[PDB]
Design a binder for this molecule. Structure first.
Ligand SMILES: Cc1cc(/C=C/C#N)cc(C)c1Nc1ccnc(Nc2ccc(C#N)cc2)n1
Ligand SMILES: NCCc1c(F)cccc1Cl
Ligand SMILES: [Mg+2]
Lengths: 556, 415
């Protein structure tokens, strides 16, 4: 015999303070019992399990499943209780590769390493916790007791320990063969390269010879699976990738659950199909979660759905990553808080696409949304390619400079260039830094009784212009905004406005161009029509005339 | 050489913090660094039975071209036991902030000569990620005292004080303070003399060591010249309506800090609905109130005291044109230090780089004065900060921070 290297075993412990499982074995038909006895005898001959004596106090349920449309049973061990008591492990499956980060490969060969899984030894001190019992015929004898010597299917630690054991085995081969890539998934090894088909198959034979150093055999009859690969919802081809078919059903009425599934398919498709939109369909899911409730589709959701159907008419593919070339990310505004982007290295050959949506919030503007989209693309790009793409953005360089130099927050976007593709992101208004000479000065104020919800809003100016408006079903904050609105509505193209509302300035200093408050929206509409606006804040109830006169008018 | 027993706090597991995305250049640098560290026995590969993790990245120290590995031990530091066994603590030297020159040295390499308790090593696990997660992340744990862990200076404290004993009694007027991986050594001599006694220090750790990659660099401070900011009011010959409104607004704010501030005579001047740019003559009564407010503002704030049992809070305001204001306090309106920066270097076009450098200099000032880092209130969106701050970081510690999303009105008053 050829000596084989043992696979080093991982020490496994139970969770602190916890003991092994002690679960009752379910009664099984005479039929299933003999089926388990034969399987376990076979497994015991192969070394996977061992019969144990009666003092081991632990037990885990064993079952026999009728493999559908066959007379053959097969054995499943219910490890749910032991898994609850087993320690946590490091899972390196958390992050999956994105296809757009992969490299083109001339050949990818698949190797089956399934019979290497039940050859990974289980830590001797932990084996006692995997004990199980085959029930006896008629319960007239003790059941046959076994425990595992190898990683059991269904146990919490088996995937991580198997992956880590294979990685350690494969490490010296990969390191000393840098002209190939190896990726493990389920019971298969995928080996890709750019080598001449003869050299490539020589590397495959050398990998088989390497794996035999631990006794791991690979089927010599080549693996069924060949490119293209169906993998994690994608199709991988040697020189291109796409998502698996995206079929939007024809339905005459739509369910909560249907719209959830529709949005999920659209979200999946948006990583290579440019311009996918989901805002109006997502608005139908607001707040509700009775999965069977029917929702009438708005006309705006019907149009967005129709637009998506056209985008999904025919297949679109992405290309793979060329590390010798820069990445370019281009972004377009779509409306209603929606943004779409493409990432490419040569023109018209996208590596991937994607979208961004306005965050939940009372007030917003296009520049902030574009900034957030840039940071989301930057982060995703670091994950997938390890570098920031260069950006093509629909905002003029002068617009950006004006924004960030004057914005109260620190803000930054990396190396970028203006692309003139409407609609352009622009600044709709900018307030003055100093009071305006020759412009009328409006001293505004508003107040409301919090019991009555009755209020007043108004202004008094240096030219003696005055207005007070009575208001119903209002609040202090609403009347303070109404007073500013009135001053904007009744002034000329240049205006100085004096207010004591910390609330209103908090909003205006955030520079919104769109709001969920129709009152803020009306103020924005007025600001856009002005040439110059200076907004001055003063503290309330100090005796500041102008504000002291009209405060008395509005709080009466 | 024999390990100090270390444990976490009661009812507290190890850190499980996700590794954040790293650039190609960073991963490469870390792979090269960790391969060396593994050969030197400083770290070991670990298996999947270790579920813990702490983020790692890589930086450039100030004025150097070699990558330094930086582990973000912030969570492990919170979870690690407090170290009062031999000493309740190192009573912070109040004389350090009074020296003419304080040089900061990276002595963290010396920590690698002391083994780490074998039962605690698993809690120092970290991962070198791969681009696009195409290969499993490389998992290590420390076998020696790690840089950036709060227990390393505590466990090394006994060895350090013996290392420095000959330098200490030959130079008794020198203040030497250790915070994390940094050694602060303050003196009152001429900078040429100062730099020479710094290099004399370096020799002592050279000698004991037999090489430290970043021991030779020095970041020089001058805490004697550190500037503060009292509240000052404008001196004008003609006051417009707008000028007086801003004055009354600033005095209203200041009256939260100084009780005796009054604004009623000045507010009476605004009685009327005049144009914002119209000049208003001050009444005698208003000028007296203004003069009395000026005198009040020349005095220290009442009831200001430092409590070592409470957090330090640091707030920062962006003032435009590359200038930034900040305040350090424990209770509102009881500022322990205020200041203003404008010299932020190599960033006239990058707001976030300027802010990152401000955070580092405020933290340094905090360490010199009180021996601990403040918790920051940052005027920035979380996603912008988290994407970029690691690109400009060059300190070996990391403070904690939260984010301000509502614009402060007080910005106007600290300008
Ligand atoms: C992540 C991954 C999944 C599969 C496969 C999973 C499955 N099923 C196969 C391999 C080899 C890899 N690993 C890598 C690493 C770098 N580049 C590539 N490029 C690449 C992969 C497949 C095809 C094809 N056809 C073309 C190029 N693959
Ligand atoms: N000049 C084409 C590449 C490029 C860049 F160098 C900087 C910003 C944007 C873009 Cl697309
Ligand atoms: Mg009022």
């Amino acid at each position: 015999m050829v000596p084989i290297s043992p696979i080093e075993t991982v020490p496994v412990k139970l969770k602190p303070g916890m003991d092994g499982p002690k679960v009752k074995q379910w009664p099984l038909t005479e039929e299933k019992i003999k089926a388990l006895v034969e399987i376990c005898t076979e497994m015991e001959k192969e070394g996977k399990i061992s019969k144990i004596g009666p003092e081991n106090p632990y037990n885990t349920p064993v079952f026999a499943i009728k493999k559908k449309d066959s007379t053959k049973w097969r054995k499943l061990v219910d490890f749910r209780e032991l898994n609850k008591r087993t320690q946590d492990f490091w899972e390196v499956q958390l992050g999956i590769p994105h296809p757009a980060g992969l490299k083109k490969k001339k050949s990818v060969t698949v190797l089956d390493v399934g019979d290497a899984y039940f050859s990974v030894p289980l830590d001797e001190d932990f084996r006692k916790y995997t004990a199980f019992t085959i029930p006896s015929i008629n319960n007239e004898t003790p059941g046959i007791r076994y425990q595992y010597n190898v990683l059991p299917q269904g146990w919490k630690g088996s995937p991580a320990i198997f992956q880590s054991s294979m990685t350690k085995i494969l490490e010296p081969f990969a390191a000393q063969n840098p002209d190939i890539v190896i990726y493990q998934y389920m019971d298969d090894l995928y080996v890709g390269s750019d080598l001449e088909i003869g050299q490539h198959r020589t590397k495959i034979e050398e990998l088989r010879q390497h794996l035999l150093r631990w006794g791991l055999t690979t089927p010599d009859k080549k693996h069924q699976k060949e490119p293209p690969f169906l993998w994690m919802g994608y199709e991988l081809h040697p020189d291109k990738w796409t998502v698996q078919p995206i079929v939007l059903p024809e339905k005459d009425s739509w369910t909560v659950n249907d719209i959830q599934k529709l949005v999920g398919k659209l979200n999946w498709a948006s990583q290579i199909y440019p311009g996918i939109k989901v805002r109006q369909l997502s608005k139908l899911l607001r707040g509700t979660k009775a999965l069977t409730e029917v929702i009438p589709l708005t006309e705006e959701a019907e149009l967005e759905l129709a637009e998506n159907r056209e985008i999904l008419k025919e297949p679109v593919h992405g290309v793979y990553y060329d590390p010798s070339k820069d990445l370019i990310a281009e972004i377009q505004k779509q409306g209603q808080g929606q943004w779409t982007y493409q990432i490419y290295q040569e023109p018209f050959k996208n590596l991937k696409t994607g979208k961004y949506a306005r965050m939940r919030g009372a007030h917003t503007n296009d520049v902030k949304q574009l900034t957030e989209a840039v940071q989301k693309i930057t982060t995703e790009s670091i994950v997938i390619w390890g570098k920031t793409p260069k950006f093509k953005l629909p905002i003029q360089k002068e617009t950006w400079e004006t924004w960030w130099t004057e914005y109260w927050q620190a803000t930054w976007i990396p190396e970028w260039e203006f692309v003139n593709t409407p609609p352009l992101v622009k600044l709709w208004y900018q307030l003055e830094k100093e009071p305006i000479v020759g412009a009328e000065t409006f001293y505004v104020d508003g107040a409301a009784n919090r019991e009555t919800k009755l209020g007043k809003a108004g202004y008094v100016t240096n030219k003696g212009r005055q207005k007070v408006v009575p208001l119903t079903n209002t609040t202090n904050q609403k009347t303070e905004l109404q007073a500013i609105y009135l001053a904007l509505q009744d002034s000329g193209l240049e205006v100085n406005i004096v207010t004591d509302s910390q609330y209103a300035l908090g909003i205006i200093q955030a520079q919104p161009d769109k709001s969920e408050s129709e009152l803020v929206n009306q103020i924005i509409e007025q600001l856009i029509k002005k040439e110059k606006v200076y907004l001055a804040w003063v503290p309330a109830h100090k005796g500041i005339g102008g504000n002291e006169q009209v405060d008395k008018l509005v709080s009466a | 050489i024999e390990t100090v027993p270390v444990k976490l706090k009661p009812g507290m597991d190890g850190p499980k913090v996700k590794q954040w995305p790293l650039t190609e250049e960073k991963i490469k640098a870390l792979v090269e660094i960790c391969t060396e560290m593994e050969k030197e026995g400083k770290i070991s590969k670990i298996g999947p039975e270790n579920p813990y993790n702490t983020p790692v990245f890589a930086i450039k120290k100030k004025d150097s071209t070699k990558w330094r590995k930086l582990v973000d031990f912030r969570e492990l530091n919170k979870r690690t036991q407090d170290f009062w066994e031999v000493q309740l603590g190192i009573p912070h030297p109040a004389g350090l902030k009074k020296k003419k020159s304080v040089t900061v040295l990276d002595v963290g390499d010396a920590y690698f000569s002391v083994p780490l308790d074998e039962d605690f090593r698993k809690y120092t696990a970290f991962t070198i990620p791969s681009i696009n997660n195409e290969t499993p992340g490389i998992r290590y744990q420390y076998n020696v005292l790690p840089q950036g862990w709060k227990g390393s200076p505590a466990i090394f404290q006994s060895s350090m004080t013996k290392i420095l004993e000959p330098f200490k009694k030959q130079n008794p007027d020198i203040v030497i303070y250790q915070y994390m991986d940094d050694l602060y050594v303050g003196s009152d001599l001429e900078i040429g003399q100062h730099r020479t006694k710094i290099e004399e220090l370096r020799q002592h750790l050279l000698r004991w060591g037999l090489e430290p990659p970043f021991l030779w660099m020095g970041y020089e401070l001058h805490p004697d010249k550190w500037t503060v900011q009292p509240i000052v009011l404008p001196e004008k010959d003609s006051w417009t309506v707008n000028d007086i409104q801003k004055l009354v607004g600033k005095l209203n704010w200041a009256s939260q800090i100084y009780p005796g501030i009054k604004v009623r005579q000045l507010s009476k001047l605004l009685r009327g609905t005049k144009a914002l740019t119209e000049v208003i003559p001050l009444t005698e009564e208003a000028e007296l109130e203004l003069a009395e407010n000026r005198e009040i503002l020349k005095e220290p704030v009442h009831g200001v005291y430092y409590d070592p049992s409470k957090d330090l809070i640091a707030e920062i305001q962006k003032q435009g044109q590359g200038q930034w204001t900040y305040q350090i306090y424990q209770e509102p309106f009881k500022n322990l230090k205020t200041g203003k920066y404008a010299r932020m270097r190599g960033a006239h076009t990058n707001d976030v780089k300027q802010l990152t450098e401000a955070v580092q200099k405020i933290t340094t000032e905090s360490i010199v004065i009180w021996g601990k880092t403040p918790k920051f209130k940052l005027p920035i969106q979380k996603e912008t900060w988290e994407t970029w701050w690691t690109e400009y970081w060059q300190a070996t510690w990391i403070p904690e921070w939260e984010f301000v999303n509502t614009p402060p009105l007080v910005k106007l008053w600290y300008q």
